[PDB]
Symmetry: C2
Subunit: 454 residues, 2 copies
Amino acid sequence: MILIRGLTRVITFDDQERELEDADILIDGPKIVAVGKNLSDRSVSRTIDGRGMIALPGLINSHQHLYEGAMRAIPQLERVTMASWLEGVLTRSAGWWRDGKFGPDVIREVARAVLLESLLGGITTVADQHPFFPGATADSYIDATIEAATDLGIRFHAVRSSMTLGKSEGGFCDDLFVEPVDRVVQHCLGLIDQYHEPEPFGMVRIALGPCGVPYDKPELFEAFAQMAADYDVRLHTHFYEPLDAGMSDHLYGMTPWRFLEKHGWASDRVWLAHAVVPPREEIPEFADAGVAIAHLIAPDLRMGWGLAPIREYLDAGITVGFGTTGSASNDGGNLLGDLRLAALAHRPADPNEPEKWLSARELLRMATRGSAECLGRPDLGVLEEGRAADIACWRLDGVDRVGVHDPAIGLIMTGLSDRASLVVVNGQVLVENERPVLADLERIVANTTALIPK
Amino acid sequence: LGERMILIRGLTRVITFDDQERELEDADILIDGPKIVAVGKNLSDRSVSRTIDGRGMIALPGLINSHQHLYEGAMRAIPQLERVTMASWLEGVLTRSAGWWRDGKFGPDVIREVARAVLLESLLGGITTVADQHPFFPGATADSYIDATIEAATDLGIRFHAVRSSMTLGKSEGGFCDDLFVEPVDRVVQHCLGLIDQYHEPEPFGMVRIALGPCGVPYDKPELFEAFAQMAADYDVRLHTHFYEPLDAGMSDHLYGMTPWRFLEKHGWASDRVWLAHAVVPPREEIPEFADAGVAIAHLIAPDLRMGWGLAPIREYLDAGITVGFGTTGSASNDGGNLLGDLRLAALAHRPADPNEPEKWLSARELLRMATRGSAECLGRPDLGVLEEGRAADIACWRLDGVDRVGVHDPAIGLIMTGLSDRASLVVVNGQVLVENERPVLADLERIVANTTALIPK
């Protein structure tokens, strides 16, 4: 077993929200054996010195687009609404793919770099989707991302994405980029059969992810609702982005939420991205249905969308998680850094009611337990006996963190760097001293850089 | 020439912010003493005593933080101040400053070490000049605060401006300034004249400068503003004050029956010697007047968001041709000194205010300019903020070859929009290499952390 000893602070996010000081975490294989003071090192093969660190559950990124790693900091996409952004991302991925520059060898290596960045930022589980890569499926994209994740040892959920409603039938998508519904459904059945690991501590899982109400056919939503029931997998889609209420009313004469109810998606199998602008009246309905919501602050701001009613969701008892989205709308995979954006950006909306503002601890919970719940993982997101040994630790003794009174608030509110010190996934140490212990960082950077489309 | 020049060779990208906004690729910077001697491709290494490999780095002028409160390094991540409005925030900070100092826990030995830690952090974040002020520490002057912070700065070799702050209008006359802690105008003036004599280095490339900073219109006597307007003319020092924070307009009207701008105008502060903090909620019609006066404004995104104040109309200031710089403020309202990191906050947070006019959103290049040449202009330093022959050799560089920056197409936008870390790779101030390979060259990092941590009030 592995013992991390003398951690300065341990934040568990267990049912009592217990935190500990100068405490240990004991690990046996995939699972946490104990969390407490002065644990025995009896059957321990190795003791890691945790002194001067804060430990959390591994961060869980509820929303990536790994292929967008190749699309960072493009000047033409710096300041663009949603429509210009979407057009520019789609045409680039289509152009690159057609030209032969975005094949599975390329996607695998882009995924490897972004997933390694993820580990380095304390992220132990990533859920990747590919809504804005039309050729994704013809490109064996998911096979490649899973190979990269498996190689690195990061816990991984692959969301099979699509755009099945063409521009001719009113889709914001356009006919070029559109697969037949049966094609999507068939492929999804195959991926579940091949890759899904439904057991506790499973390291790869498949989810089903139409891009959204404006982008996919109702028949696809209904197909996936049946499939999720029959195979016990989760459902994901984007939700209440600013143009959606109007597009939904025009196509279907109902709100996005009523559409979801009609087509089987008002259930506890579902997590929803963004949720920026729902009608307030529907919020209690979200809660009763048991849907989960992922807060994605960075793209909400980047696209000019604004502030999701996160306080209201928490008030309602709705599960709230956290994500970065892809690097074409972030443009990094730094989940911890993005928490600070949310911590600050929500405040001016309630200038005289600071009790409404999201707190550091609320935000860290979103990035761990809340995201775990989004992905339907009761085995993750919590440091307690019996959960998975997915752990992220940051040093507190840097010169940029002198004077910090509360280390949890400190993680969000201070620092020159969000680099994790020690990262464990599935009981394997993958980062120590801010550096990968199994992956060759320099070689990956070189290999991936030579493959970025130019 | 020299025989002891430094050549930084083959930088991947160099952003000059010169009058032509020139950028260079695979280019060099040549340094002789405190000044830059050349910027361009394949510079000669004849007179060079040392060559630094710039390959894989982007080089900027050194970042300039127009607004620190170094004493607040001791006030980070305090639970009771996490979510508070200005009123509760101000009370909490003043209470601790006054309490700690009163109890003997905040003497010059403590201040020196807190300052040393936060200034070393600033260097590690690519910041080569810091302007520090102390409005929310009433005992600062009695405490020899500015002597301690100048000692820390000069030990580190970071370029430093010390703003002598005050709260001269007592509670009695309707100020936050508490009658037990209000300094007579002449005592403040005399203290400032003394600091100028002892410390001010008005020559080009000077490493310590003094500025004059009343906390603001709701906080100080008109006599002080006038006294300072006179000193600025006599000594060519800069004037600074806070400007159009929420509620300022109401307070000015109650005290003087005019706007804070009108007040400043009346008392000689509507000039080109002046820089102004925050500037969140001015009346729109006064903006062209700010422009005509030639005042400069520092954008302080982190505390504006933290306090729930919101978005200063920065696009409007740029449109009007007003100089805009950037600062972090103190670590009680940030709570870090990470200027580069705060740029991303501003890049993103301004956008939802203009959801359908992306042309109004602040660009990465505009934000980096604020944090360099813009802040330089705020501080009255034509010798800084630009990578160009003749200017100071204050340079900050970041590596571009990290796994977290793979796929970046424009490295300037990348500096704002990507990364797990804002740590600078190579930092040069006044021609001295102070950080290289992300590590201090001269400063003892472990020792400083140990010493400062032991001295934080407990």
